[PDB]
Amino acid sequence: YNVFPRTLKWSKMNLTYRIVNYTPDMTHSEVEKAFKKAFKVWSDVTPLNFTRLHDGIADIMISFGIKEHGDFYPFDGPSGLLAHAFPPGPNYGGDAHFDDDETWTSSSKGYNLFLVAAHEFGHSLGLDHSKDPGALMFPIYTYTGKSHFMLPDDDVQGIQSLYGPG
Amino acid sequence: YNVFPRTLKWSKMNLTYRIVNYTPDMTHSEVEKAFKKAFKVWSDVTPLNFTRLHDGIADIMISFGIKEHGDFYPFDGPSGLLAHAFPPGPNYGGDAHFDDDETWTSSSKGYNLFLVAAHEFGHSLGLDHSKDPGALMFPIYTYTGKSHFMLPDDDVQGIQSLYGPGDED
Amino acid sequence: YNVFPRTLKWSKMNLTYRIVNYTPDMTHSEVEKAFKKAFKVWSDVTPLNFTRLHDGIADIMISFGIKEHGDFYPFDGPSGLLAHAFPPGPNYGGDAHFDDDETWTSSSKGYNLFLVAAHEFGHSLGLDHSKDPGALMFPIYTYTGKSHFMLPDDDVQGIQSLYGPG
Amino acid sequence: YNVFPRTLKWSKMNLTYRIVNYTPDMTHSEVEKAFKKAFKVWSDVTPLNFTRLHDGIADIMISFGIKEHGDFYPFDGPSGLLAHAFPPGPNYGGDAHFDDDETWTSSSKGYNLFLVAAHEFGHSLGLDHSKDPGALMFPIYTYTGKSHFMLPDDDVQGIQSLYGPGDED
Ligand SMILES: O=C(N[C@@H]1CCCS(=O)(=O)C1)c1ccc(Oc2ccc(C#C[C@]3(O)CN4CCC3CC4)cc2)cc1
Ligand SMILES: O=C(N[C@@H]1CCCS(=O)(=O)C1)c1ccc(Oc2ccc(C#C[C@]3(O)CN4CCC3CC4)cc2)cc1
Ligand SMILES: O=C(N[C@H]1CCCS(=O)(=O)C1)c1ccc(Oc2ccc(C#C[C@]3(O)CN4CCC3CC4)cc2)cc1
Ligand SMILES: O=C(N[C@H]1CCCS(=O)(=O)C1)c1ccc(Oc2ccc(C#C[C@]3(O)CN4CCC3CC4)cc2)cc1
Ligand SMILES: [Ca+2]
Ligand SMILES: [Ca+2]
Ligand SMILES: [Ca+2]
Ligand SMILES: [Ca+2]
Ligand SMILES: [Ca+2]
Ligand SMILES: [Ca+2]
Ligand SMILES: [Ca+2]
Ligand SMILES: [Ca+2]
Ligand code: NA
Ligand code: NA
Ligand code: NA
Ligand code: NA
Ligand SMILES: [Zn+2]
Ligand SMILES: [Zn+2]
Ligand SMILES: [Zn+2]
Ligand SMILES: [Zn+2]
Ligand SMILES: [Zn+2]
Ligand SMILES: [Zn+2]
Ligand SMILES: [Zn+2]
Ligand SMILES: [Zn+2]
Secondary structure, three states, X not given: OEEOEOOOOOOOOEEEEEEOOEOOOOOHHHHHHHHHHHHHHHHOOOOOEEEEOOOOOOOEEXXXXXXXXXXXXXXXXXXXXXXXXXXXXXXXXXXXXXXXXXXXXXXXXXXXXXXXXXXXXXXXXXXXXXXXXXXXXXXXXXXXXXXXXXXOHHHHHHHHHHHOOO | OOEOOOEOOOOOOEXXXXXXXXXXXXXXXXXXXXXXXXXXXXXXXXXXXXXXXXXXXXXXXXXXXXXXXXXXXXXXXXXXXXXEEOOOOOOOOOOEEEEOOOOEXXXXXOEEHXXXXXXXXXXXXXXXXXXXXXXXXXXXXXXXOOOOOOOXXXXXXXXXXXXXXXXXX | OEEOEOOOOOOOXXXXXXXXXXXXXXXXXXXXXXXXXXHHHHXXXXXXXXXXXXXXXXXXXXXXXXXXXXXXXXXOOOOOOOEEEOOOOOOOOOOEEEEOOOOEEOOOOOEEHHHHHHHHHHHHOOEOOOOOOOOOOOOOOOOOOOOOOOOOHHHHHHHHHHHOOO | XXXXXXXXXXXXXXXXXXXXXXXXXXXXXXXXXXXXXHHHHHHOOOOOEEXXXXXXXXXXXXXXXXXXXXXXXXXXXXXXXXXXXXXOOOOOOOOEEEEOOOOEEOOOOOEEHHHHHHHHHHHHHOEEOOOOOOOOOOOOOOOOOOOOOOOOHHHHHHHHHHHOOOOOO
């Protein structure tokens, strides 16, 4: 027999990402910074490193889309589903899509992109939803106003359980 | 925290299905009996339970379509791809699609719907194709009609590696 | 230059149809009768004839589907959009899809299939929406209880303006 | 009663568009200037009006995507198909898609976004490809950058056969 085995973790520590397109809501510079900072969340506590490619295929393809946007898991217009990502693996594995029917922001007016991305990249790297209500991997969006992100211990233990400490 | 599970499987034992639409080739009643039996192939041999829904969102959405019918697996007219099913997962996950350019039956003629459905529902549950030529999960159609259907050992081991044996008696 | 020319009418009077699949809500016999009767509406007042095929390609392919069902014009779950059809032409032209997230009926409990089909086949044959509130080609569903359908004069004039009288 | 119109065209002169997302290759501002100019190619020469929407449902939804991006017209990486647009109609009708595996510019380098958009928007409005090698609707990319853009006669005749000339002065 055969089952469908999942890829439980990336078998390499060095990963690439490509920002394929850009939301109307934020500057390219703001978007870029949000994603760089969201990857940093995970690289800061593991041996994982993240390199941005401008062209061609990277492990983690990032794009913004609305409704049916190419994977038959359509988004839903404003609110509800915010974004989704695929777990580790080839092709669509690791990739992240953000519903551009949301208003994305570098602060408080709409969804904070850094925080939603950081959550999504947890998925990209092998983490499911946490049941701990303080966790970044908890299913619900929270934005504290705080200018300095610290990754909650539950997420640190989760990611470390896959990759070890940095 | 939670890491994703080891294999694609359902994380709950109680599953629902919906017959979204029906083939011209057989009565509603024959289609329903075929699919009920196909699920029982798997429930008999694990702790899985299957309940039919008449409408709304079920885990396993069953439908009959031809050519482009809403995914990346277009059908191809008569013979060829008979049907396909998505592995366990949300939305399209677990769904089962049957090519209605085939002849579906409850006999030895055309393609026996019970047998192809039993096969497809292994995919819906987490089994890919087997290489064991006696396996129900073998990717080639073979008709048998034994009064008491026995699931081949290779399929019993595959499915129980995913969900365990359920009540062994 | 080129525009995209529409096919304004079928260039043949004899047309075929295929019922590809069947709703859960009605017997095959009931469904069959509804479609036969809905075609009859248009054949009764024009030289058009309709032949049912069981297999292969016919001019008017009839199927029931939910959500995304193969043409990127998805249905919408219960209520709202009931069905849609394509105007005359090859391939998808003439075809009719019915949203099987509606309850279809031979009477009053849910949508009367005969009446919605008859409307859809008006589209299949080259008619747009009527502005006359009594017309079968008016955009809004009405079901009178009446056991005997008579096609409103506005629709008779519309279809005849394309094909002539029977 | 109403028979369908003779050609695929918009049955209203006031049309809206939405820039759903943006290419990495150019600033928001450059992208907006390119598209505004592309629409003005057609509004200058018919009674058509185009208004930008910042969100929601517009007649013409513009977006940048790669490979499978939600239709039956997957992109193909660099060169090849540059972009495609649906003819006038509801939902996908009028929408314009640009392959972001191309290099989009506001110069002679890569593919000039203004020119490819001007071309695509003819499709969004009801023009198919022309055989006139000097036509904007010719299916092959050619760069010119004349300060005052003149729409070629073949494209003026095509578009006005659909919507008339608007104010001729
Ligand atoms: O789409 C989403 N949710 C649902 C999916 C199904 C459809 S639905 O249920 O409507 C929405 C979705 C929701 C949230 C999300 O990203 C998330 C998830 C959790 C957080 C968080 C948090 C914090 O408490 C706030 N700070 C202190 C502790 C911790 C970290 C920083 C932020 C973004 C990403 C996606
Ligand atoms: O889907 C539909 N409508 C909308 C489309 C956009 C989404 S929405 O606006 O929610 C619904 C739709 C609606 C209706 C429909 O079929 C129709 C349309 C009109 C009729 C009618 C009628 C009658 O008045 C009743 N009798 C006496 C005169 C005449 C004929 C017999 C019946 C079915 C077919 C499709
Ligand atoms: O679509 C199908 N396969 C290919 C078609 C060609 C195009 S493709 O090559 O992509 C896939 C397809 C789909 C479903 C199928 O269902 C199947 C698969 C296997 C069987 C079987 C069998 C037995 O040998 C007969 N009995 C004794 C032992 C076992 C069990 C009972 C029956 C139906 C079989 C084939
Ligand atoms: O995708 C495209 N075409 C093919 C690519 C190969 C795959 S395919 O063969 O399917 C289609 C494609 C898409 C958009 C294009 O935009 C176009 C099309 C034509 C032009 C032009 C031109 C001129 O000659 C230059 N100037 C003087 C006269 C005219 C007008 C101004 C510019 C952009 C051009 C090509
Ligand atoms: Ca990937
Ligand atoms: Ca949303
Ligand atoms: Ca087939
Ligand atoms: Ca499912
Ligand atoms: Ca057809
Ligand atoms: Ca509906
Ligand atoms: Ca390309
Ligand atoms: Ca549109
Ligand atoms: Na947005
Ligand atoms: Na069939
Ligand atoms: Na139904
Ligand atoms: Na690009
Ligand atoms: Zn997606
Ligand atoms: Zn999540
Ligand atoms: Zn399918
Ligand atoms: Zn199979
Ligand atoms: Zn359809
Ligand atoms: Zn209608
Ligand atoms: Zn496209
Ligand atoms: Zn073109």
